[PDB]
């Protein structure tokens, strides 16, 4: 929501195809393609850099070898920041075989280093690969670049990788692969970098004609794919754009994008599609929900997009997406914002439209990319190609203010309360100071614009009614204001309050609330413009002034409220599960009437307030209008809630009980105990001593998901051959395991291998080995079972489980079982058939059992019990 | 019924509160001091409290039916519905359509030539005696036109240069015609012969890429009639190619970045734009297309069978026709044209106003007793047999008198529904009673609506300077609670709820104690913001299609639904689009459970007992195994590979499907002892 739409640059170059096709070049300047900027012979285009210094496009010097013909360069780019390079490419060479010529494509990587020249540059001569217009999209990634082929073999595609100067490589889907004819593989390309190894992606528009988008991973020795998803409609194209984009700032790619400007039900504004990457290949979904659009047939929405990033300082990236048909043919852009993890929010904050006097552009948006600062002022810049020309729009700073407001006479003394009529109005003089600092800055930075700024302030006194409780003294009027300085240190001023001797209402306290906004926007130089508040922007701050209530004639009104709480039901409380979090509050009043009561509560981060609101029906139950403001309090860590019970009266030594519900978040950061108090008094405020807090401790757990499988590489083996008792022919249970849990927790790994059964050993000198991971410390103990009569016990069940014969447990600890690690091992020892014998039968079957586990507490598994932390294995010994 | 106050002044803010709510006009009906506001109740509570039923302002909706004389229009009637519509009620008008018979046809052969379409032009090139003979029995003298299409000229569809481009034809080189897109070849004429004739002329072409470029050659088609010409009556086409088609964005392969405008402009009817021009989106002809009244009959090979037929879902009026590779059988699917062509009555409406929302219902001929849903899908009608469409109007708030149309796609008869914004309420005038509101002020059903600075119910009170003892009597809810629930200064009994100029906030009520701000949020937004649903007073009123505390399920429909059209698969309830997988099985739509061990054991048994016959153990089978499904086919997934029950190892994948223990095998022709 901060998108210049005033002091912008624009760089109008008339080179025929100009402004098609654009990128982020090294943050100092950018790079614009021009395909269609005939050279030569039907030849190339032709590429433009432009600086911000100057509103001017320098055309770039390039080696165009004569054996590139009609390639229209420009068409596709690519710029990595690693160290900063470029990719520009002519993704249409013709190369004439005589009968018929080809397309093959031809790329230049340019920068502060060797203009080198890469498909690379063997003139791919003439005969699977001749019209695959390589280059036709491309993306960077740490192991080098990466252009795409579209018309490989059956216009299957796919994508060649560039090493260090070490001979390519090539991703197509196998033959093997007997679907994916012309559906242009690899149209568009995007990285999808991760705490492990990259990942790539192709864009795949006509997959069966409708549109999938698969996504690659490179495995050591493997390079396989990773998932995939079909379109939701035919023709819709589904697979067109795509950007991988990190709704925090940790790294890893979080999620993903896609295009499909051709798609609808009932209105064709057009289609992106948000699909988070999870980890766990054959599964992969694109809906995590939701899909942005918009209300206008024909727009082509999701034409182009790129990572903005942090703009509006939330620590939740923004992204842009175009859409070049909006309105009459015009151009338009969209501006959405991440929430937390994999989700974007459908409601978009801006739609800069070409309506925004740009004079006369067709449709604009066509492509953009953006995430670098370009023109020098700090923040990130967007550059968002246009017919013709191109334009530049900054990011302008979103800083928000925090308040707070205070009556330096806490109450009213009475004094001037219910006055008289000799002698005069002594308008008593309460005062109200109130404050303004900015505290959330990590963008800006220091230094000039963070800190210095105008503000316009509106302080008003009981507004919602025509009968002003007071006025301000410097201006006399029931309101008044003053602009002011703001800083990063706050700035506080009392202003002084007149009240009129004789008044009715003294029940409902006197309200004063601020509007307060960033007037002029001057600043030093023009290097900041426009500053501006963010979307949360409670600019309507208020605070009360309670009255003496009259308790009487006398009496001396004293204030005397209890309070406690409880959790009915509340049962171990592990986060995962139990998100909201009932508590029944009761209350008394053993004292004075309070009539404005509040209760406010202490709680850590993890969780915050939401309406009840219920019905339908209940109880004996809570009834109550009530009004809750949260705010951080505390140095580090904690945070007050509090809730006023707004409109009417607690008398007597009357009880009453609420219900107040708080959501926790899955991911509550909080000790292994989390603690909350509850304060309460009256609206005149605590006027002595010991406070009347009441407050509970809890045992805190976390939700986790462990599992574990028996993998199919297991020695089902049994056959007839049995004329003696021999030893070797070891049997090997393979067990892998895996967390999709969310959080980093130490486990241990126990197992349970039969061995001697009446001194016959079953199986003997069985250890466990584990591969693909480090030599981990696995522990070894004997234990002999119940010995009930194995004789008949075992004719029930040909099964040999560890019951009967003296099993053997392996604790195999972890250190640190990280999320999503599927370490795996197995177990393997030459199995004797001698105690084959010792039973009296045939086809008998042992049994090896594998449980996984973790302390009891502080952790634990979350849908209500899962044994999936609990597999087998059965082999056969049937040997006649 | 139900009936939630909103600000109550007049008769019309107690209309503006919903469905469920009345007022009452009989004077004398508030208590020594009562609220205004209690005139509007429910209709059952306003008799219970003595309010007369005459005395019972209900605006009600209702439908219009100005039928014509005849000749107006021939099937779609009425003609013309004017509508009076009250917010949040339904107004309900009925749509009779007995369709009649053929109108005069005009058809027009879209046919692809190319190499592979050579023994089709061969068993086609003059086959059209049969087509007029076969167009003899319904309609009469109709019409017959041609339009030939390949390709783009320009590569990567086809290679541009050199002479192969004269000479495309793959080794025979029976002097084919230069490669090309769209060639009018012959107009829409009465004479069958002359057309024949006209067509085995030309020869084939060819191109590059597989797939065909036939999209392009659709618009060009329906766009420019001014130089092809129409009849103003019927106009069918039907595709045929024995290869893919190519749609927008597939054109930046040839470096054209410039989209489908929608008109052919030709020179020689033949294009020569196709090149400066890019393909024509898919949905953009579902629209064009089904304004000129157009509408295409699938029919090429099995092969391309089944991807026309997921085009026959979105564009409607369409065909799918599995034929051989020679379009010898091609005279027959015109008899399975009519057959589901005059067979699909549709009944859909011009883009309407968010402020509007429409539905349907649907009585079909053949047993079909559908209700609530747009379109008129009825696949079960033809010649002269009625059918009925229940059309349902609601709107959200007092719209302006607007007027939209409800056409049947394919269909030039436009029926111009009227629209009218009903919500006003009718009694008396100001000649009746100036004396009570003492002057100051006029009359409406009992109550006085008084001035700009008088106020009261009775006119009798300004608003400076005003208060009385026990006035504030009803001005309290209970002897225990503060005065008009402060927020609200009391005046003349009722209270006066203060303004707050925040975006949202706004108090209301007798006391005024509630407010459009503090209720359930969802999505850092007020009851699901303004899109979703509403506050008032703490319960969220969600818009239509949207329930929960919150808007917080937010859709009744069901995205649960996978391409089985069965909830959530194998097990999980549908909850607020969600699935709710049982056991380990994952999201979104519950198949994959990553977690099972993949059970080939206790299997093994009923393996050889479907497949192979080695004795169904336990007792028989098709009892001790609902793996009912044993397909002749290579299904897979699941590749499984155990033994048998005696020795051999016996081969088997195993696709399971949807719920609990049902599968679908296929076990392997062999064994290995
Ligand atoms: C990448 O994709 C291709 C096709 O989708 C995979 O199959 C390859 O396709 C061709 C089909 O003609 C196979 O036939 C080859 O013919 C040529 C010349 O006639 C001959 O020189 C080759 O030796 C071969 O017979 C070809 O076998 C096949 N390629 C491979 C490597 O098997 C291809 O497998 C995929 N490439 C990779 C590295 O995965
Ligand atoms: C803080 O907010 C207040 C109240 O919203 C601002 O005061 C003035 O508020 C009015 C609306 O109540 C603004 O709209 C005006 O509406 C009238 C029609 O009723 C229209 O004719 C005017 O052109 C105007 O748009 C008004 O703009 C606004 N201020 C004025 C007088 O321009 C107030 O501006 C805010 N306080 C500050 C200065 O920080
Ligand atoms: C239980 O009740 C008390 C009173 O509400 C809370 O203790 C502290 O109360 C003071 C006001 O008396 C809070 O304001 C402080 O005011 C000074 C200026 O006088 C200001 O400089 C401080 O920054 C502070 O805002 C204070 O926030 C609050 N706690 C502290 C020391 O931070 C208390 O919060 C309640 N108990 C709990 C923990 O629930
Ligand atoms: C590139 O080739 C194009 C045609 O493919 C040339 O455009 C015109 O083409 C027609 C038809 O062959 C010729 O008769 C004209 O002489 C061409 N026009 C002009 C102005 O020369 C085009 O000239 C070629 N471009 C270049 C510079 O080689
Ligand atoms: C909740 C409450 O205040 N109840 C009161 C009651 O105490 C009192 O006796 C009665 C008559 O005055 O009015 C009512
Ligand atoms: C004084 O009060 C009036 C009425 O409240 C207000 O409209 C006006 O803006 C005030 N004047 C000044 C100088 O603040
Ligand atoms: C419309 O048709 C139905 C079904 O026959 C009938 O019940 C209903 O009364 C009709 N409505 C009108 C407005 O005539
Ligand atoms: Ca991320
Ligand atoms: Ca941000
Ligand atoms: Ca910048
Ligand atoms: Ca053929």
């Given amino acids: 929501f901060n998108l210049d739409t005033e002091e912008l640059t624009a760089f109008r170059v008339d080179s025929a195809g100009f402004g098609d096709s654009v990128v982020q070049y090294a943050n100092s300047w950018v790079v614009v393609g021009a395909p269609q900027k005939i050279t030569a012979a039907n030849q190339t285009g032709g590429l433009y850099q432009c600086g911000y210094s100057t509103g001017a496009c320098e055309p770039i010097g390039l080696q165009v070898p004569p054996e590139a013909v009609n390639m229209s360069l420009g068409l596709s780019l690519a710029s990595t920041t690693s160290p900063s390079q470029l990719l520009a490419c002519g993704p249409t060479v013709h190369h004439e075989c005589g009968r018929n010529m080809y397309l093959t494509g031809l790329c230049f990587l340019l920068g502060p280093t060797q203009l080198t020249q890469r498909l690379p540059v063997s003139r791919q001569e003439c005969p699977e690969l001749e019209m695959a217009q390589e280059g036709f999209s491309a993306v960077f990634t740490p192991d080098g670049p990466v252009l795409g082929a579209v018309g490989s073999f059956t216009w299957s595609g796919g994508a060649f990788l560039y090493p260090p100067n070490m001979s390519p490589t090539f991703i197509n889907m196998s033959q093997e692969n007997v679907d994916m004819r012309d559906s242009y593989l690899g149209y568009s390309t995007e990285l999808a970098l991760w705490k492990g190894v990259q990942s790539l992606v192709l864009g795949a528009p006509r997959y069966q004609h409708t549109g999938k988008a698969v996504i690659f991973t490179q495995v050591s020795r493997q390079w396989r794919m990773k998932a995939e998803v079909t379109g939701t409609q035919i023709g819709s194209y589904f697979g067109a754009s795509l950007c991988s984009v990190d709704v925090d700032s940790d790294g890893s790619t979080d999620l993903v994008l896609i295009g499909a400007p051709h798609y609808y039900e009932q209105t064709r504004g057009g289609q992106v599609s948000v699909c988070p990457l999870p980890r766990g290949w054959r599964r992969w979904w694109c809906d995590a929900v939701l899909y942005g659009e918009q209300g206008h047939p024909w727009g082509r929405f999701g034409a182009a997009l790129t990572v903005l990033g942090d703009v509006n300082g939330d620590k939740l990236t923004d992204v842009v997406i175009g859409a070049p048909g909006e309105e009459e043919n015009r151009g338009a852009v969209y501006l959405f914002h991440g929430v937390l993890g994999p989700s974007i929010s459908p409601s978009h904050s801006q739609r800069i439209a070409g309506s925004q006097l740009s004079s006369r552009l067709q449709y604009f948006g066509q492509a953009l990319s953006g995430g670098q600062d370009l023109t020098q002022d700090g923040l990130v810049d967007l550059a968002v190609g246009a017919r013709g020309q191109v334009l530049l729009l900054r990011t302008r700073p979103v800083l928000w203010v925090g308040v707070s407001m205070q009556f330096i006479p806490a109450e009213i003394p009475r004094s001037a309360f219910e006055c008289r009529e000799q002698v005069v109005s002594e308008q008593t003089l309460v005062q109200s100071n109130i404050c303004l600092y900015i505290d959330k800055r990590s963008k800006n930075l220091l230094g000039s614009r963070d800190l210095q700024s105008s503000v316009t302030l509106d302080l008003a006194l009981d507004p919602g009614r025509l009968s002003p409780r007071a006025t301000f003294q410097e201006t006399k009027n029931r309101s008044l204001s003053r602009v002011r300085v703001l800083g990063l240190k706050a700035h506080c001023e009392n202003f002084n309050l007149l009240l009129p001797s004789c008044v009715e209402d003294s029940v409902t306290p006197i309200t004063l609330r601020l509007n307060f906004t960033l007037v002029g926007k001057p600043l030093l130089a023009f290097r900041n413009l426009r500053p501006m508040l963010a979307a949360d922007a409670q600019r309507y701050f208020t605070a009360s002034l309670p009255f003496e209530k009259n308790c009487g004639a006398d009496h001396i009104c004293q204030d005397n409220l209890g309070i406690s709480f409880s959790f009915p039901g509340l049962k171990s409380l592990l986060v995962g599960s139990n998100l909201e979090l009932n508590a029944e509050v009761m209350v008394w009043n053993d004292g004075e009437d309070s009539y404005g009561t509040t209760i406010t509560f202490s709680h850590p981060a993890g969780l915050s307030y939401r309406y009840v609101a219920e019905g339908q029906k209940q109880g004996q139950l809570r009834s109550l209008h009530l009004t809750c403001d949260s705010a951080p309090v505390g140095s580090q860590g904690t945070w007050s809630t509090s809730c006023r019970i707004n409109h009417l009266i607690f008398r007597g030594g009357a009880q009453i009980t609420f219900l107040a519900t708080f959501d926790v978040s899955p991911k509550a950061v909080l000790g292994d105990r989390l603690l909350l108090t509850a304060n309460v008094s009256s609206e005149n405020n605590t006027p002595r001593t010991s406070k009347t807090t009441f407050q509970l401790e809890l045992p805190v757990k976390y939700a986790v998901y462990t599992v574990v499988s028996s993998h199919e590489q297991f020695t089902k083996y049994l056959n007839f051959s049995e004329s003696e008792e021999k030893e070797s022919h070891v049997a090997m249970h393979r067990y892998q395991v895996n967390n999709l849990g969310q959080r980093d927790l130490p486990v241990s790994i126990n197992f349970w291998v039969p061995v001697e059964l009446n001194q016959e050993a079953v199986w003997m000198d069985v250890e466990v080995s584990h591969p693909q991971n480090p030599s981990l410390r696995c522990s070894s103990e004997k234990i002999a079972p119940p010995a009930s009569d194995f004789l008949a016990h075992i004719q029930k069940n040909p099964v040999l489980d560890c019951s009967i014969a003296g099993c053997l447990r392996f604790r195999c600890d972890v250190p640190s079982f990280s999320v999503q690690e599927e370490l795996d091992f197995t177990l393997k020892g030459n199995l004797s058939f001698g105690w084959v014998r010792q039973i009296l039968q045939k086809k008998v079957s042992v049994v090896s059992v594998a449980e996984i586990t973790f302390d009891t507490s502080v952790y634990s598994q979350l849908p209500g019990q899962e044994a999936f932390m609990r597999a087998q294995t059965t082999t056969v010994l049937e040997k006649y | ?673």
Avoid at chain 2, 237 to 253: I, R, S
Avoid at chain 2, 366 to 389: A, L, S
Avoid at chain 2, 439 to 449: A, V
Wanted: charged share 25%.
């Fill in chain 2, 1 to 673: 019924q139900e009936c939630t106050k909103f600000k109550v002044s007049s008769c019309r803010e107690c209309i503006e509160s919903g469905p469920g709510c009345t007022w009452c006009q009989k004077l004398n009906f508030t208590g020594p001091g009562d609220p205004d506001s209690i005139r509007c109740d429910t209709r059952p509570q306003l008799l219970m409290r003595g309010c007369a039923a005459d005395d019972i302002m209900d605006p009600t909706s209702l439908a219009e039916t100005q039928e014509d004389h005849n000749g107006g229009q021939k099937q779609l009637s009425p003609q013309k519905v004017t509508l009076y519509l009250r917010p949040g009620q339904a107004a309900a008008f009925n749509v009779t359509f007995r369709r009649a018979k053929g109108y005069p046809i005009d058809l027009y052969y879209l046919m692809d030539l190319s190499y592979s379409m050579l023994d089709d032009l061969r068993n086609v090139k003059k086959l059209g005696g049969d087509l007029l003979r076969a167009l003899n029995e319904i309609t009469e003298s109709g019409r017959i036109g041609f339009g030939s299409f390949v390709d783009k000229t320009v590569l990567p569809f086809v290679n541009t240069h050199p002479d192969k481009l004269r000479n495309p034809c793959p080794n025979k080189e029976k002097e084919c015609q230069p490669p090309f897109a769209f060639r009018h070849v012959l107009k829409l004429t009465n004479n069958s012969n002359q057309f024949q004739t006209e067509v085995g002329k030309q020869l084939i072409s060819g191109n590059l890429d597989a797939p065909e470029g036939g999209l392009d050659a659709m618009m060009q088609v329906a766009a420019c009639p001014e130089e092809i010409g129409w009849r103003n009556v019927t106009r069918l086409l039907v595709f045929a190619t024995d290869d893919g088609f190519h749609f927008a964005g597939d054109g930046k392969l040839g470096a054209i970045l410039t989209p489908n405008d929608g008109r052919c402009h030709l020179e020689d009817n033949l294009y020569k734009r196709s090149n400066e021009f890019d393909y024509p989106s898919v949905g953009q002809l579902a629209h064009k297309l089904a304004e000129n009244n157009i509408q295409p009959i699938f029919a090429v090979t099995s092969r391309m069978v089944k991807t026309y037929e997921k085009l026959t879902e979105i564009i409607p009026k369409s065909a799918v026709g599995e034929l051989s590779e020679d379009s010898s059988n091609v005279v027959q699917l015109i008899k399975n044209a009519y057959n589901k062509l005059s067979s699909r009555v549709f009944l859909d409406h011009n883009a309407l106003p968010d402020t509007l929302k429409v539905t349907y219902d649907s009585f079909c001929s053949n047993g079909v007793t559908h209700r609530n849903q747009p379109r008129g899908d009825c696949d079960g009608v033809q010649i002269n047999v009625p059918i009925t469409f229940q059309v349902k109007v609601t709107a959200t708030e007092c719209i302006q008198e607007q007027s939209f149309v409800i056409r049947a796609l394919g269909f030039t008869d436009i029926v111009t529904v009227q629209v009218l914004p009903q919500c006003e309420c009718r009694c008396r005038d100001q000649s009746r009673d100036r004396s009570l509101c003492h002057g100051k002020g006029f009359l409406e059903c009992g109550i006085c609506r008084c001035d700009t600075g008088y106020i009261g119910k009775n006119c009798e009170c300004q608003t400076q300077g005003r208060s009385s003892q026990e006035l504030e009597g009803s001005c309290r809810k209970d002897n225990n609670s503060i005065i008009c629930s402060g927020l609200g200064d009391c005046v003349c009994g009722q209270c006066l709820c203060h303004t707050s100029d925040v975006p949202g906030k706004l108090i209301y009520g007798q006391y005024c104690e509630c407010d459009t701000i503090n209720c359930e949020r969802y999505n850092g937004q007020v009851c699901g913001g303004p899109g979703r649903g509403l506050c008032f007073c703490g319960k969220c009123r969600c818009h239509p299609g949207f329930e929960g505390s919150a808007c917080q399920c937010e859709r009744t429909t069901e995205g649960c639904l996978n391409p089985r059209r069965v909830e959530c698969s194998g097990r999980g309830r549908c909850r607020c689009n969600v699935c709710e997988c049982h056991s380990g099985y994952q999201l979104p739509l519950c198949q994959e459970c990553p977690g099972c061990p993949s059970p080939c054991g206790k299997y093994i048994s009923c393996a050889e007992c479907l497949k192979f016959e080695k004795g169904p153990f336990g007792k028989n089978c098709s009892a001790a195994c609902p793996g009912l499904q044993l397909s002749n086919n290579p299904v897979k997934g699941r590749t499984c590979k155990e033994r048998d029950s005696e020795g051999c190892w016996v081969a088997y994948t195993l696709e399971q499907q949807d719920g609990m223990d049902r599968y679908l095998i296929y076990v392997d022709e062999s064994r290995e002892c």
